[PDB]
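Worked example 3. Consider a protein that binds chloride ion.
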Amino acid sequence: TKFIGCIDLHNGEVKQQHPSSYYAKLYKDRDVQGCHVIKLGPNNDDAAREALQESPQFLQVGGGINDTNCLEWLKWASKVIVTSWLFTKEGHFQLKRLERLTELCGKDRIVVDLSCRKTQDGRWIVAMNKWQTLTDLELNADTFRELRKYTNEFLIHAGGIDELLVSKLFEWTKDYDDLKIVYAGGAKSVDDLKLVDELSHGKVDLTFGSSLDIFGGNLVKFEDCCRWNEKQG
Ligand SMILES: [Cl-]
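Given these inputs, the predicted complex is written out as structure tokens:
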């Protein structure tokens, strides 16, 4: 279990003041591997490239990723993160679209980002279009078994963390040794690192974003998250 950093971009600006390259440099300097730059809506491409080019092939990029632009983004991103393109506007999962991305990029350069909503006890359904659309894809062991054929990494995007979900991510992927699972679910305590480590037997990584001091949050220290990583080896 490691701390994963992020940079969210909206209207060409970081969601927080510092430009995107500041954060890209910081993550590189502190050797925070596997961070994600996420474009929320349009007009973010320059700010995304600013971050990626500050630390070339070190940060991932998501938001508006499809078969037409994935190779160009991979010039500067370590991996591309697919989101809504895997679904029709009606919310139907399109496995053939994932297969196309893998065919173009390689399984080591794509991330499948699934935003999920807990509908009922022990049930999580993938959602799209700013959460407002439930898709026909459920999170469960079967979904992980099938989709891991096409990617080496999932970003699972969901007060405290959804502890039961983290436990389930472990349970559903226990037999996979080569699969990276990044959880992003609003963590706002440094204590969540050890908690996620315990729940997942070390197999799930944890994003911190807006709660961090470096983004103007007053809840979690970025340096504490880096120190956690440094202790893991
Ligand atoms: Cl990466």
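Take a moment to read the result before moving on. The first strand starts at residue 3 and ends at 4. The chain has eight helices and twelve strands.
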